[PDB]
Amino acid sequence: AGPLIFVEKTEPVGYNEIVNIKMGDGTVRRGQVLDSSADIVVVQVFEGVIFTGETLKLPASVDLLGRILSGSGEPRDGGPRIVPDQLLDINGAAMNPYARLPPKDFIQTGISTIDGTNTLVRGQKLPIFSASGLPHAEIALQIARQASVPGSESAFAVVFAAMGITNEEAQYFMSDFEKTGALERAVVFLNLADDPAVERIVTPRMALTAAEYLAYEHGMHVLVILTDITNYAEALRQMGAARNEVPGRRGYPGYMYTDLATLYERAGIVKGAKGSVTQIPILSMPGDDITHPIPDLSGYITEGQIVVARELHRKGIYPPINVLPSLSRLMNSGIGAGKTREDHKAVSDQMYAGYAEGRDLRGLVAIVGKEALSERDTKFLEFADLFEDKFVRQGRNENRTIEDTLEIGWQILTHLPENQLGRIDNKYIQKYHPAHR
Amino acid sequence: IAGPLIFVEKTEPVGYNEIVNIKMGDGTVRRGQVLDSSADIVVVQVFEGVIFTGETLKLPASVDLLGRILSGSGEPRDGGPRIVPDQLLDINGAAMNPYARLPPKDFIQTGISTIDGTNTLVRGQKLPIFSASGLPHAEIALQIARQASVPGSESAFAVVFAAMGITNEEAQYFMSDFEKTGALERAVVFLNLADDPAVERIVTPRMALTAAEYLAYEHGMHVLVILTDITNYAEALRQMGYPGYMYTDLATLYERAGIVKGAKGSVTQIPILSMPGDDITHPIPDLSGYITEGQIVVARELHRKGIYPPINVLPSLSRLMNSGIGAGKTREDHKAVSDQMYAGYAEGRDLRGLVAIVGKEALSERDTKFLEFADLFEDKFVRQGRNENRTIEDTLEIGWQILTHLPENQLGRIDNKYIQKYHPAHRKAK
Numbered sequence: 096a097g098p099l100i101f102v103e104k105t106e107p108v109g110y111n112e113i114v115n116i117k118m119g120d121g122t123v124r125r126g127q128v129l130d131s132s133a134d135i136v137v138v139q140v141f142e143g144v145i146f147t148g149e150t151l152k153l154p155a156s157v158d159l160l161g162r163i164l165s166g167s168g169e170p171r172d173g174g175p176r177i178v179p180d181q182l183l184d185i186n187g188a189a190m191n192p193y194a195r196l197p198p199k200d201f202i203q204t205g206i207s208t209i210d211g212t213n214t215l216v217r218g219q220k221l222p223i224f225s226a227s228g229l230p231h232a233e234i235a236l237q238i239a240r241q242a243s244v245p246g247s248e249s250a251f252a253v254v255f256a257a258m259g260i261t262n263e264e265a266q267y268f269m270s271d272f273e274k275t276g277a278l279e280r281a282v283v284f285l286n287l288a289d290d291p292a293v294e295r296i297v298t299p300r301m302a303l304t305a306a307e308y309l310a311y312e313h314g315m316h317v318l319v320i321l322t323d324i325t326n327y328a329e330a331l332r333q334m335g336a337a338r339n340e341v342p343g344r345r346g347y348p349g350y351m352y353t354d355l356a357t358l359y360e361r362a363g364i365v366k367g368a369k370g371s372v373t374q375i376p377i378l379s380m381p382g383d384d385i386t387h388p389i390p391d392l393s394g395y396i397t398e399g400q401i402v403v404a405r406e407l408h409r410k411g412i413y414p415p416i417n418v419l420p421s422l423s424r425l426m427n428s429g430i431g432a433g434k435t436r437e438d439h440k441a442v443s444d445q446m447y448a449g450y451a452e453g454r455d456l457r458g459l460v461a462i463v464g465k466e467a468l469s470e471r472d473t474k475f476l477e478f479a480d481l482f483e484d485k486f487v488r489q490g491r492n493e494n495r496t497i498e499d500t501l502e503i504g505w506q507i508l509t510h511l512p513e514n515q516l517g518r519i520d521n522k523y524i525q526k527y528h529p530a531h532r
Numbered sequence: 533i534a535g536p537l538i539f540v541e542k543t544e545p546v547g548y549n550e551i552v553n554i555k556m557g558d559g560t561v562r563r564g565q566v567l568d569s570s571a572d573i574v575v576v577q578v579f580e581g582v583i584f585t586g587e588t589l590k591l592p593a594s595v596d597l598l599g600r601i602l603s604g605s606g607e608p609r610d611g612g613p614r615i616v617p618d619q620l621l622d623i624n625g626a627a628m629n630p631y632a633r634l635p636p637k638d639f640i641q642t643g644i645s646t647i648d649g650t651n652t653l654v655r656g657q658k659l660p661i662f663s664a665s666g667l668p669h670a671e672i673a674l675q676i677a678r679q680a681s682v683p684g685s686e687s688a689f690a691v692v693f694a695a696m697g698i699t700n701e702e703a704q705y706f707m708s709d710f711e712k713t714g715a716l717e718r719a720v721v722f723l724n725l726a727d728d729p730a731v732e733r734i735v736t737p738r739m740a741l742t743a744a745e746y747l748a749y750e751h752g753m754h755v756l757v758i759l760t761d762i763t764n765y766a767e768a769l770r771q772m773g774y775p776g777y778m779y780t781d782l783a784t785l786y787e788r789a790g791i792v793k794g795a796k797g798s799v800t801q802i803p804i805l806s807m808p809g810d811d812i813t814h815p816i817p818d819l820s821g822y823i824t825e826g827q828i829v830v831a832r833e834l835h836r837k838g839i840y841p842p843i844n845v846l847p848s849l850s851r852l853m854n855s856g857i858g859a860g861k862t863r864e865d866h867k868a869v870s871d872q873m874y875a876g877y878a879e880g881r882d883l884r885g886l887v888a889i890v891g892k893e894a895l896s897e898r899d900t901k902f903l904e905f906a907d908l909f910e911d912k913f914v915r916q917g918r919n920e921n922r923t924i925e926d927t928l929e930i931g932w933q934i935l936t937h938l939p940e941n942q943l944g945r946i947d948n949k950y951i952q953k954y955h956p957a958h959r960k961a962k
């Protein structure tokens with residue numbers, strides 16, 4: 096009748112078995128079993144002799160940082176089990192950590208097509224929208240390695256959670272975190288394709304609980320990277336009461352309509368305002384809607400999105416992010432004097448407009464021929480190439496500061512006639528344009 | 533297959549890979565190579581007396597295109613006579629540049645609240661409908677074709693409706709709907725059937741856009757072009773993953789929008805971008821080139837819940853909305869009401885998550901109001917009849933009514949001046 100909770104399995108259980116559960120806060124719930132792995136039971140609680148169990152707990156400690164764990168929080172790094180400061184329920188009920196404050200202030204990802212044009216702010220949920228065969232995992236990993244909060248008095252941490260991945264992918268992520276030293280400031284949760292589906296379902300909840308704990312109890316800005324929500328959804332649609340039931344039809348369980356919202360609700364500035372939880376969920380377009388209907392991923396898209404584009408990938412460009420369909424709705428809260436730089440908005444606006452114009456002119460060029468294009472139009476056409484070649488394109492290991500990003504922006508903007516810079520205040524042209532300054 | 537596609541009248545027999553000249557609207561010629569052909573239309577890939585010099589494929593242009601149903605090649609499909617042209621216009625877009633260097637602006641009333649209210653369509657904009665297999669994007673497209681208008685515009689309004697690769701049953705349905713509602717009288721309708729030559733499918737949006745340019749520029753009209761659907765267009769390129777040149781080819785479609793020279797007309801596009809239900813047989817194309825001014829998102833969640841039209845405003849966006857709203861265009865309170873409904877709906881939807889974490893009875897009284905607001909938004913604002921044509925006033929007033937469910941002190945996005953003037957609890961009866 097109510098919330099799904101996650102319980103430590105201590106004996107075999109049957110479908111719809113009535114159970115009593117001891118919660119993290121010491122209270123008890125009664126509920127019904129939906130599904131189970133070897134170690135975990137999924138229980139749907141009721142409001143207000145049988146099996147008595149305890150909830151599955153995150154072993155919460157600052158010593159989570161530097162560790163690589165399974166989806167259930169068990170070590171994968173050869174290290175000892177986490178010694179907990181606190182044992183926390185994982186479904187979101189623990190801590191009540193979120194403030195009623197808007198997201199704000201800069202997270203530097205080091206990727207120009209995010210920081211420059213679609214800025215990530217602390218407390219935001221900003222999905223990466225992608226598809227099979229595109230390098231969204233590479234982008235996610237690069238952000239994990241590079242992200243920081245310039246000028247903040249609060250410490251920064253990363254929670255990286257990968258779901259449904261292959262053995263070789265897991266080995267790769269582990270090696271990357273270890274060799275780069277990104278592991279020092281990260282908690283890494285790795286769920287394998289062949290791990291139990293219930294473990295996959297618990298994975299983002301373990302990750303979000305760790306993030307909330309570090310943000311709220313330790314005053315950290317925490318960035319949570321979740322790759323891939325689509326993979327999570329493929330497990331969900333075959334778990335418990337959803338098994339062989341069809342979305343929108345009789346028999347499809349109500350919790351399937353709100354499950355994704357239990358994940359996307361969990362982001363924001365935390366109480367005290369010294370910390371925050373920011374999410375970058377990867378949403379890969381599944382390709383199999385007809386055979387594998389999943390919960391609508393649109394619910395996760397309320398504060399913008401970063402779009403990975405096959406066009407740019409096929410051009411040989413990494414990261415292949417198309418800024419034009421990309422958006423950060425909270426960008427203005429994270430940029431400008433004292434955050435990035437005063438000319439940030441102006442430079443972003445002008446690059447966006449110039450790139451959009453240049454891309455339209457690729458069409459016009461095809462319609463009339465290169466020789467028929469005006470000199471002014473040719474400059475914008477060329478600007479779109481410069482934008483893709485110099486601004487969009489950056490190394491896998493290239494961590495650009497926002498100043499680096501804005502400088503590249505100004506350099507490519509010099510290709511346009513100064514009189515065509517309609518989105519940039521004259522004050523910023525005089526102060527920052529390379530032909531001046 | 534590298535160069536851009538140009539369409540040429542079949543006036544003489546041609547062969548594959550034959551090198552040809554194409555005569556352009558200004559008397560110059562471009563050189564190309566024959567890629568493919570139907571009986572009447574040659575597809576040339578362009579580069580950079582002795583050889584074939586071809587004429588561009590032409591639209592027979594006249595105001596009498598209005599009220600007609602044509603094929604993708606412009607031939608009558610309505611039993612009527614062939615169009616008698618005032619002009620023969622190159623459909624490749626090259627003989628005439630009607631577009632002004634002006635930003636899109638001013639209101640197009642679709643009559644659909646989740647467009648007009650929260651992500652307003654403006655004249656000259658390209659605003660795709662982003663949808664997927666099994667969703668009612670075609671119903672939405674037809675509803676917009678029936679309902680759209682430009683309130684208070686001195687310029688007359690027309691619709692160009694182009695459907696690509698459709699079944700005979702869909703064709704009959706579209707024709708019937710245009711005819712019986714009278715929507716046909718202000719429209720030029722281009723219907724390309726699935727079994728029509730693939731060449732005619734790729735010519736279809738170019739015929740449509742040429743018709744819209746002619747009406748907009750030569751007759752001072754605001755023209756709304758509805759193109760359904762681009763995924764099917766992309767598949768025709770495939771049967772002629774996707775070819776590399778597709779991205780440039782799409783730009784030849786999406787460049788063709790905006791206010792026209794003189795600013796008494798415009799070409800606005802609503803392309804339908806539908807994601808295939810089966811990746812294996814119908815690969816997912818990168819149509820993101822078309823998405824530069826926002827998107828209207830058709831959502832499975834809302835469709836599953838039995839709501840029409842199933843538009844989720846939160847991922848939807850109109851980048852140019854501010855240029856189409858307010859005093860003299862819609863109403864002064866538009867931006868505030870939109871901002872507040874968006875914020876309230878987003879908060880309510882997050883609170884659906886919280887309910888599924890802590891249980892409904894654990895929510896605060898305040899949070900419960902926002903939770904209930906999300907239900908009201910979906911049931912009263914999102915939901916509307918297939919033939920329910922809402923004025924912007926109607927949609928703003930629905931908005932105000934549902935906003936009364938929230939505590940007045942929680943209306944952070946609304947200027948006190950608009951609360952005093954328009955909030956049902958304060959507004960004076962006049």
Ligand SMILES: NCCc1ccc(S(=O)(=O)F)cc1
Pocket residue numbers: 542544545546547548568569570571572
């Ligand atoms: N197989 C279709 C290709 C084609 C079809 C027709 C011609 S033509 O007769 O009009 F010259 C040329 C090439």
Ligand SMILES: [Cl-]
Pocket residue numbers: 342351352389390391832833836
């Ligand atoms: Cl859903």
